[PDB]
């Protein structure tokens, strides 16, 4: 079916959470007519909701902070779907504060997941993928678990003060 069956739930959720946290969010949905198999439609809402909540809570900064940082005052959250060959690609993008990669590394060292000696040459993907480790810092492990139950993949791109883009890829069947 069309992914609108999932996406149409989100403006109310986004608006309620933004209100609760006294933030202003410009929420844009694209590609809502993208069709995919019912099994995906039935399961993908929960992970997407988690990612949207992360963007509103942890990503987009309060207006006053954005102004102080010389950013546009209202944060933008874009949820998109598209076909790419045999895959459907779903992206959740915010222009908030980004994920703090140094914080991740420090936590990974604390937890014994990496030796300090290996931190300097870690790739960006290797750093951000620590967020999918169970217990790391209801977590992102559960997002990845659902995506993988759908034979999908997930990746994160993020830069300090720029924002965060989470990409889910799903197969045709
Ligand atoms: N969209 C967005 N923006 C900033 C974030 C900051 C931290 C986290 C996170 C930490 N531990 N698990 N997730 C997720 C974020 N997601």
From Swiss-Prot:
Biological classification of the source: Bacteria, Thermotogati, Thermotogota, Thermotogae, Thermotogales
Histidine kinase domain location: 1-173
Name of the protein described by the UniProt record: Chemotaxis protein CheA
Residues of the full protein shown: 356 to 540 of 671
Segments crossing the lipid bilayer: none
Taxonomy, superkingdom: Bacteria
Claim: Membrane is one of the keywords in the record: no
GO cellular component: cytoplasm
GO molecular function, one term: protein domain specific binding
Biological-process GO terms, alphabetical: chemotaxis
């Amino acid at each position: 079916v069309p992914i609108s069956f999932v996406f149409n739930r989100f403006p109310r959720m986004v608006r309620d959470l933004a209100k609760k946290m006294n933030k202003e969010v410009n929420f844009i949905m694209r590609g809502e007519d993208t069709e995919l198999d019912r099994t995906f439609v039935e399961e993908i809402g929960e992970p997407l909701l988690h990612l949207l909540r992360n963007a509103i809570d942890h990503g987009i900064e309060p207006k006053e902070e954005r102004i102080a940082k010389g950013k546009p005052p209202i944060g933008t959250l874009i949820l998109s779907a598209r076909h790419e060959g045999n895959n459907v690609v779903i992206e959740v993008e915010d222009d908030g504060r980004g994920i703090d990669k140094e914080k991740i590394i420090r936590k990974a060292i604390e937890k014994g997941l990496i030796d300090e000696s290996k931190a300097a040459t870690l790739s960006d993907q290797e750093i951000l993928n620590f967020l999918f480790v169970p217990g790391f810092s209801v977590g992102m492990d559960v997002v990845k678990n659902v995506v993988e139950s759908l034979n999908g993949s997930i990746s994160i791109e993020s830069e300090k003060d720029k924002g965060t883009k989470v990409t889910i890829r799903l197969p045709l069947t």
